[PDB]
């Protein structure tokens, strides 16, 4: 039909990457308030029926690794996959405590040909991070 | 008889390309605040695009940055949804 088949043993995995602290070298500050977001997100998604997992102050490589392994796990019994990134960022990039990494490389782990068990299944990514330095003054 | 390797992805960004994203040290980032709020009320009865659309409107109409520095004062934000989904997504039945 027109709706993703949601009839699986489980809804799916929800990976939360709560990055609050960053090596002085990155020049990034402490993301105060991120613990609250992570807490509210975890509750929310657990509520939907997602198996929530929260990682904190992740190094760049850790984020890359963490997601890669998730794409290799067996997803046959899940309706979808969700990942939430809470951290610093610039256009096309998200900060790990380590430094900067491309959002595309992070998500690519779940492309059709690389994570077949999620093929034809929705792969969601919620991203709380900056994507540049512009500001919206708004209008009216 | 094949599917695009890039199909079925959805990126719900807190803000549009090239812009900053706002976060309240006390209440948490606006986008997340918004998202959870909406998800709590409609997560199990609205389609993902309806949910996120309402999150956009919420972020846009319910938030305005406060800052001593007038350069970062009374500024606004609008999330950005990227859909490669090929179906309607519902988190229920």
């Amino acid at each position: 039909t027109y709706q993703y088949n949601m009839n699986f043993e489980k809804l799916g995995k929800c990976i939360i990457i709560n990055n609050k602290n960053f090596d002085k070298v990155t020049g990034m500050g402490v993301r105060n308030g991120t613990d609250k977001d992570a807490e509210a997100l975890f509750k929310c998604f657990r509520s939907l029926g997602f198996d929530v997992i929260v990682y904190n102050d992740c190094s760049c490589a850790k984020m890359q690794d963490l997601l890669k392994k998730a794409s290799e796990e067996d997803h046959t019994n899940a309706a979808c996959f969700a990942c939430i990134l809470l951290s610093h960022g610039e256009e096309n990039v998200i900060y790990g405590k380590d430094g900067v990494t491309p959002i595309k490389d992070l998500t690519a782990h779940f492309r059709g040909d690389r994570c077949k068990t999620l093929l034809e299944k929705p792969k969601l990514f919620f991203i709380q991070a900056c994507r540049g330095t512009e500001l919206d003054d708004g209008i009216q | 008889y094949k599917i695009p390797v890039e199909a079925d992805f959805l990126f719900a960004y807190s803000t549009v390309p090239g812009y900053y994203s706002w976060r309240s040290p006390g209440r948490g980032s606006w986008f997340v605040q918004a998202l959870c709020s909406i998800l709590e009320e409609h997560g199990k009865d609205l389609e993902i695009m309806q949910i996120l659309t309402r999150v956009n409107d919420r972020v846009a109409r319910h938030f305005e940055s406060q800052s001593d520095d007038p350069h970062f004062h009374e500024k606004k934000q609008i999330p950005c949804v990227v859909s490669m989904l090929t179906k309607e997504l519902y988190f229920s039945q």
């Binding site: 993301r31 105060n32 610093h88 | 807190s14 706002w22 309240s24 040290p25 940055s65 970062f72």
Partner: peptide, 4 residues
């Protein structure tokens, strides 16, 4: 508020 802060910036992310």
């Amino acid at each position: 508020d802060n910036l992310x």
